[PDB]
Design a protein around this nucleic acid. Structure first.
Ligand SMILES: [Mg+2]
Length: 142
DNA sequence: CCAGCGTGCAGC
DNA sequence: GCTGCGCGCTGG
């Protein structure tokens, strides 16, 4: 399953190969424009390439990185805790993990596994992609 | 200038 | 069901 590229350019379209990275991106986008958050994302991943690394980070350091995105202490603590549970807690969908809600879970179920037909998003950007998927899945050979 | 917005979430 | 978290960006 390879989710198709869309005219709406969701960053999820390029991150689906690594579910942890995709989920970190949804967190970066919590009430934050992609325009500011995505460049900081690359800086984050460069310094924290994996859940393994992130789960051992000092959140205060992660917060300094996240500063110009707002919600910096909240999300830094979320990211460390999320990463820890991602690796050590038993889970089937990432909504069971701290810091991932319906929007992160819906993203996961559209991009990281083949469950887009069962997903019913309430996120505007996700709906755009999802509606477009329903309209075009035949043409796209899905 | 400056009120509202931007691919939410947990805790209450 | 509501609130705290929070910055730079955005556009009248
Ligand atoms: Mg959760």
């Amino acid at each position: 399953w390879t989710p198709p590229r869309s005219p709406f350019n969701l960053v999820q379209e390029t991150l689906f190969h690594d579910p942890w990275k995709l989920l970190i991106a949804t967190i970066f986008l919590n009430k934050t424009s992609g325009k500011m958050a995505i460049p900081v994302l690359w800086k984050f991943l460069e310094k924290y390439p994996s859940a393994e690394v992130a789960r051992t980070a000092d959140w205060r350091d992660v917060s300094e990185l996240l500063k110009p995105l707002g919600l910096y202490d909240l999300r830094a603590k979320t990211i460390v805790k999320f990463s820890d549970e991602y690796l050590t807690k038993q889970w089937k969908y990432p909504i069971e993990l701290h810091g991932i809600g319906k929007y992160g879970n819906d993203s996961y179920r559209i991009f990281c596994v083949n469950e887009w037909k069962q997903v019913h998003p309430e996120n505007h950007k996700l709906n755009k992609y999802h509606d477009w998927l329903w309209e075009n899945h035949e043409k796209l050979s899905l």
